[PDB]
Design a protein around this ligand. Structure first.
Ligand SMILES: O=C(N[C@@H](Cc1ccccc1)C(=O)N1CC(C(=O)O)C1)c1cc2cc(Cl)ccc2[nH]1
Ligand SMILES: Cc1cc2nc3c(=O)[nH]c(=O)nc-3n(C[C@H](O)[C@H](O)[C@H](O)CO)c2cc1C
Ligand SMILES: Cc1cc2nc3c(=O)[nH]c(=O)nc-3n(C[C@H](O)[C@H](O)[C@H](O)CO)c2cc1C
Ligand SMILES: *Cc1c(COP(=O)(O)O)cnc(C)c1O
Ligand SMILES: *Cc1c(COP(=O)(O)O)cnc(C)c1O
Ligand SMILES: CC(=O)N[C@@H]1O[C@H](CO)[C@@H](O)[C@H](O)[C@H]1O
Ligand SMILES: CC(=O)N[C@@H]1O[C@H](CO)[C@@H](O)[C@H](O)[C@H]1O
Lengths: 790, 77, 790, 69
């Protein structure tokens, strides 16, 4: 697969596949021609890999998730297959720009944020490690909406990513399956029957997942809803069944109990389990060894229904006795907990479940009885314990606590970061962990070094490989070798030059994409993640305004210049998140157009933050904002991407941030604000934001400017809602960390004035990022939960 | 010569005989893919509906209309 | 007004108006027949529009200018009235070619360049916006001379544009007025009397100004000089008075203190003010509300005399007390500054003014005393400040600084582009702006989308309307909608085809008009504007020679072909401008007839550059040369025409060029060379052209070829004068921007080799041209200076 | 229309380059649509547009049954 044959294949595809020649081909045709050229290189290994799993029958892993935030596929595939340099040359020889062609590809945005990206990063690591693993989700016709900013406000535009075709997916018509809904339960003498149900077909689409340089190509199987089989209206009504896989729910850490969402959850669960059972029965392998052959990871509670579905299949269909089925079920499933925030918790009203999934409601009840019976037997006098451990909540309306169903149906439950897993085990589910201490575990999150270093930052990966070899790609712990260069000035300046070129490249991006002129030598202060009160870009916004006033105060004061970037999407119904976005675009407008500040401070609201755009801004970042309230961010993964790419972190002791300090030395990160214990103490004692506004003169000014219309002259009370929440309903204590935050920020700029020390600290961060590879995360999952090996 | 029509997702229904009577079943002919059609994304066009007529001094304007895009698919003859 | 009635009217006019039939009619008769047919459609609305202003009495605007560069009127009128397609069809049905008939019309070339064209563009916008505005100028019997090239040199031929008759002007005999000259001042007890004066009558000729599709038809009133009332000699001597409106002074940015010019300035001012006063007194409206009913814009200082004339009328005639008259005067006038070049500054010797306008000299003195008294009162110790702010200059001979008279007699003073208005306010008139900061403003120039898009480039206007509707005609900011098609290859190729057809049409022009054979696929590199050392077509000429040598050097080298076009008129007395023209025709002769270059590079000196010819070449242009030295071009408008018509710009950060980069993104224009600050630094440090000639090998060669006769064998030292100025007197630093220029030019050709990227940038220019509509310019003038509304 | 304007063949020769057959009345709307384009968009006078329209279209009748009308 050298340059000459690659150009040949490209021309062949352009002609036969796109039906074009060089005079009529579009940029999109060129992209597709290259995609097909690269895709062909996956076929041999994909067939051999799947064939290998059949022949040698190793225990398989099934990552069941309602989200897979995959981003773009061309570059990733070229890199993991070792074809990037040859393709780059082929395309160049043909007189084209591979970068332009790459930009044509749509992100596969089938996720909202960290949760869906973790799944994507895990598929890449599982393939690089050579595990027999599959990803199972929904092929949404529309992913996370494309975000636009209109009059400073976010606007949602449909993300019609399949319009022009996806060359990376393969319809697998022979594996279509029927999924059942509604109907009614019928208890007969031949077993229980679920009858009079409506059927929706599920057609699976396979996407290859190439491992990094190892001939392994695994599969990501996504299901699409299709109707089975007044006339016109009857045909149009087929849209109703197909609506099940029509669109991704765009909420991050937020439970929206809509009936359609329930259908999606059962849909993916029913199709997936049937497909796994069928594959099991054809393995040439009695369901006795089912769990020795199958491991199914529940990504959050979203696919919780998989537990009573497996039981339904085992009992109602396969005729296994309850006790045996229940045992195999627990040995099969493992559950991962991703959050302790109350609004993200899934609690489905038994009423809704009764109508849609009557047989599953009976199964959940049975599980609950057997569950409570056990608890009643061991702790008789303790009545309230049964109330707290039940899968059923009778608060107002009766509903199912999906998290509790996941705990009892799984043999292992894990958090995503030390601090989070601890809270999950000992605080949130104390009643359960006490009974089964060995069940709860931790599996700190990770990111793949391929997409998040090699792909997104070729300059950095090269510099590192030049100094310590390429072994770090497959074993990131290798980065500690970078320590030897701590006093190496030439290396430190080489490190600083890579970051400098990333900034220039990205600056070109920001100036063509946005009005503003950027100071390429300014410090790039970045906060990109979903807009959330708990993630606090608002606190960040308070600081930007602070820096603003300060310049207006003393114009000629020696101020390290900054280009502040904040980007992220807000869920459509999240009013406060939307208000915060408007607040930020308003502030930027004032700052960027104020003659006294000029090139000193520039603010940008990076719109349509998504995976492919993360790959651009992250490598160009100097300072990474990870400032959620302590105890709110279960883990975080953006924090890791920035650390691996040469940015210093300013943040709280939350999620994985804590472990980043552990690995790199707390001194080499700008930690600040309240800690888990400090937020608790403040809660007990009672929080009154009004007091800090009183004490803090810089804060009072920021606040008065916001509330008085300084940043919304034509709408003086536009941000009234933001002011009220901060003073009387700030569950995330913005004012309480404001002082420590601004103080911390001041120190950052002081260190930035010292290039040699700044870069020395960056080096200590990069050299200490090895722990955060998803290869290490997957290794721990494999040996302590799935019991599988390469 | 060129033929110009509509790419119906569903063509004339498939006919079944049940208890001696005709029954209609949807003709989902594209389900497995049509290798004979070629999407021509570069020639997509907007079609207008509803709205209202506005008679101005620059000519008559058809405004406030709802738009539906039309993506053509070419099949060789 | 459909096709059948239009053909009927045409035949009617051909018969009754031209006294012809189809067998004896000339092409000129056909043109006139059509002109009359179209003219008739203006009458109803013109009478109703002027009648409307009388009835509803809205505040009126009077644009007083010594120049109105109108171009041709037929097409413009047909378009603004929505009759072009019907006429086109009518003429075609009659067996004629409307294009041929249109070519018969003479340009109304009553202007020199940008200044007079801005006035013309403003009349079109003011009518399209429906403002009660009038244009007041001089009906020159001869406009800007017709230029001929003889033996490579410019020759001037009288522009006798009225010889065959102007159907677009209407003599208004009932409004004739007497203008006074010479005589002597007599101070009596009934007031001051200006007696024993010679009288010259002023007969006004009205020309309609149709708004774009809105039933509004405003008026442009031009005054013609007529004598009042040895015998034979006495009658012939009547030519002396009529000589006042005989010919336009053909100088661009150059003050020529000739007595006849002074007479023209007073002539138009006296006639205009009397006419305005008379109309005021008949309005059914006490001069107390004069400025609430009248606004008079001074286009440059040319009509500066209008200030003491209004005072003369108010005081000597209307008997108002000085203080009151002075107040009304300032509230009436507003002054527009068009240049900071020293040779354009009007400084009339008090001696000359004393003899011609003795009463006005007394009035100017009085104004100056009251003015200086105010300054002496506020800044006593500052003596030199009085010297710098006086309307009188006692340097050698005493003279009047007309610009200072305009500032003190106006309530608003404006520049024509951000960078220029800034220099005018804070540098040139710092002494005045400091006292009255609110007086100085900016009003960035503009061009009308009708004549400069719809008329001149029907192909482009149609393509745009096809994609985004026709609303952009009246609101050019609408062009930003063109962004949506940035990745649309079919649209980009459609855009490129329109430009391709413009080039072919214009190529037909160049081959019949000139010897040379043109490469229709070559890049059309164009620089058309008045010949000026400051505009630097000389620098351009240095580059052409550079490209020439390069081809001679490496013949088979891959060179993007170019058709270089440079056109413009030089003022008759401007020796260096004339030398530069000869230098350019000489170079072309060598390049165009050199067998080794052949179809690679062709040079054309487009003769008789004028408005109707601008409408042809501009739409056919790929690369627009806007290369004046930074700080010299106050604004420019040709730069805007090219941007609106699909050409990429290579230029300096000067005049409006700066704002074009702001709107389109600096990256989407080929900016280069020194900036305002860089020219300053070089000035302080001292400029020595000899050093660049030393350092630059390509430059040294160009220069040696010029100075040695390579381009003038029969006259080896013919360009000696050009060589001397460049080495020892180049106030515009040609050699200093030569390197950056040639480098910039190289990049242009590189982008031209990439049709998709070239056209993508063009799109970004066109989509960003909305700001440069004169509709927006007029809106700002109306609400911030004239205080008027549609 | 777009293909016509790119043909390098302003609509005088449109019907010498274009023939559109109306298969039954189903696409009858094509007549006033062409006119709409010619008049409202291309700015041609009604008379000229109407003439080109008739030279462009041809109609095929497929039935005399009342319920198909
Ligand atoms: O879709 C692929 N091939 C196509 C092949 C095809 C194309 C046109 C008609 C029929 C078949 C395919 O299987 N289908 C298109 C149909 C649909 O859209 O439903 C079904 C494909 C090949 C491939 C190879 C790799 Cl390595 C990865 C992904 C891949 N997809
Ligand atoms: C972590 C978090 C996530 C939230 N997500 C959403 C959301 O996705 N959609 C929505 O409408 N509201 C959302 N909210 C707002 C929530 O429903 C409620 O309106 C407010 O917290 C009450 O102040 C969220 C709140 C929090 C704290
Ligand atoms: C911007 C500009 C405009 C000029 N216009 C004229 C002109 O119109 N007629 C003329 O005789 N000289 C003109 N000159 C030349 C000027 O009077 C003087 O001769 C030279 O600049 C001295 O080198 C001009 C020079 C400049 C810089
Ligand atoms: C990694 C990633 C996230 C998660 O970032 P946090 O800062 O951990 O919230 C979200 N969105 C995208 C597009 C990502 O790449
Ligand atoms: C517009 C125009 C000008 C002014 O052009 P610049 O390039 O701005 O100097 C001069 N002459 C004519 C005939 C014009 O159309
Ligand atoms: C419910 C949910 O989306 N939780 C999110 O999960 C990801 C992946 O574990 C964590 O990094 C993150 O902190 C957390 O907010
Ligand atoms: C005195 C004079 O003619 N000035 C000219 O005025 C026009 C109209 O404002 C400007 O565009 C141009 O740059 C400038 O050279």
């Amino acid at each position: 697969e050298n340059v000459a044959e690659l150009k040949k294949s490209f021309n062949r595809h352009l002609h036969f596949t796109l039906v074009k020649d060089r005079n009529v081909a579009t940029t999109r045709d060129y992209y597709f021609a290259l995609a097909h050229t690269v895709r062909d290189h996956l076929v041999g290994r994909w067939i051999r890999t799947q064939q290998h799993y059949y022949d040698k029958c190793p225990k398989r892993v099934y990552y069941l998730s309602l989200e897979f935030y995959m981003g773009r596929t061309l570059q990733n595939t070229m890199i993991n297959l070792g074809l990037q340099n040859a393709c780059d040359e082929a395309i160049y020889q043909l007189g084209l720009d591979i970068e332009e062609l790459e930009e044509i590809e749509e992100d596969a945005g089938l996720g909202n944020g960290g949760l869906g990206r973790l799944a994507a990063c895990f598929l890449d690591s599982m393939a690089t490690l050579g595990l027999a693993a599959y990803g199972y989700g929904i092929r949404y016709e529309y992913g996370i909406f494309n975000q636009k900013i209109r009059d400073g406000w976010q606007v949602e535009e449909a993300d019609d990513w399949l319009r022009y075709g996806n060359p990376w997916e393969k319809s697998r018509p022979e594996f279509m399956l029927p999924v059942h809904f509604y109907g009614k339960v019928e208890h007969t003498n031949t077993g229980t029957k679920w009858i009079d149900t409506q059927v929706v077909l599920a057609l699976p689409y396979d996407t290859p997942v190439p491992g990094y340089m190892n001939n392994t190509v695994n599969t990501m199987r996504l299901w699409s809803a299709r109707a089975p089989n007044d006339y016109i209206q009857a045909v149009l009504d087929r849209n109703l069944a197909e609506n099940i896989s029509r669109v991704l729910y765009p909420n991050d850490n937020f439970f929206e109990g809509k009936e359609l969402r329930l259908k999606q959850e059962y849909f993916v669960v029913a199709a997936t389990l049937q497909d796994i059972i069928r594959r099991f029965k054809a393995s040439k392998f009695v369901f006795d060894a089912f769990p020795d052959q199958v491991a199914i990871q529940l990504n959050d509670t979203h696919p919780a229904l998989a537990i009573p579905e497996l039981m339904r299949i085992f009992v109602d269909i396969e005729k296994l006795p309850w006790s045996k089925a229940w045992e195999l079920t627990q040995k099969t499933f493992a559950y991962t907990n991703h959050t302790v925030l109350p609004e993200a918790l899934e609690r489905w009203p038994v009423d809704l479940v009764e109508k849609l999934l009557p047989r599953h409601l009976e199964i959940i009840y049975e599980i609950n009885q057997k569950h409570l019976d056990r608890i009643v037997a061991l702790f008789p006098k303790d009545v309230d314990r049964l109330r707290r451990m039940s899968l059923i909540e009778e608060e107002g309306s009766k509903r199912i606590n999906m998290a509790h169903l996941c705990i009892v149906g799984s043999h292992a439950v894990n958090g995503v970061a030390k601090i989070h897993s601890d809270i999950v085990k000992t605080k949130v589910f104390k009643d359960f962990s006490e009974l089964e201490p060995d069940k709860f575990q931790n599996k700190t999150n990770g990111i793949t070094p391929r997409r998040w270093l090699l792909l997104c930052n070729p300059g950095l990966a090269e510099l590192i490989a030049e100094k310590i070899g390429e072994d770090y790609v497959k074993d990131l712990s290798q980065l500690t070798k970078l320590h030897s260069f701590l006093g190496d000035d030439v290396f430190l300046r080489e490190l600083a030059k890579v970051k400098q070129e990333n900034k220039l490249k990205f600056s070109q991006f920001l100036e063509t994409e946005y009005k503003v002129k950027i100071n390429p030598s300014s410090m790039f202060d970045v906060q990109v993640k979903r807009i959330h009160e708990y993630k606090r870009q608002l606190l960040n916004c308070l600081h930007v305004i602070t820096m603003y006033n300060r310049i207006k105060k003393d114009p000629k004061k020696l101020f390290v210049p900054r280009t502040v970037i904040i980007g992220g999407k807000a869920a459509p119904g999240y009013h406060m998140a939307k208000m915060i976005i408007k607040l930020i675009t308003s502030v930027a407008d004032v700052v960027n157009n104020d003659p006294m500040v000029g090139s000193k401070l520039k603010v940008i609201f990076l719109e349509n933050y998504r995976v492919s755009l993360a790959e651009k801004v992250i490598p160009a970042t100097d300072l990474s904002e990870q400032i959620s309230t302590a105890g709110t961010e279960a883990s975080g993964t953006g924090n890791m991407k920035f650390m691996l790419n040469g940015a210093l972190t300013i943040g709280t002791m939350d999620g994985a941030n804590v472990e980043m300090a552990e690995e790199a030395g707390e001194e080499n990160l700008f930690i600040f604000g309240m800690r888990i214990d400090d937020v608790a103490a403040l809660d007990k004692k009672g929080y009154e934001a009004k007091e800090y506004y009183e004490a803090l003169p810089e804060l009072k000014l920021v606040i008065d400017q916001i509330d008085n219309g300084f940043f919304s002259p034509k709408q003086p009370d536009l941000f009234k809602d933001i002011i009220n929440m901060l003073f009387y309903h700030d569950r995330f204590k913005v004012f309480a960390d404001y002082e420590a935050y601004v103080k911390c920020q001041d120190k950052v700029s002081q260190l930035y004035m010292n290039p040699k020390a700044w870069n020395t600290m960056v080096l200590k961060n990069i050299a200490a990022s090895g722990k955060f590879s998803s290869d290490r995360t997957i290794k721990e999952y494999a040996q302590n939960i799935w019991n599988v090996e390469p």
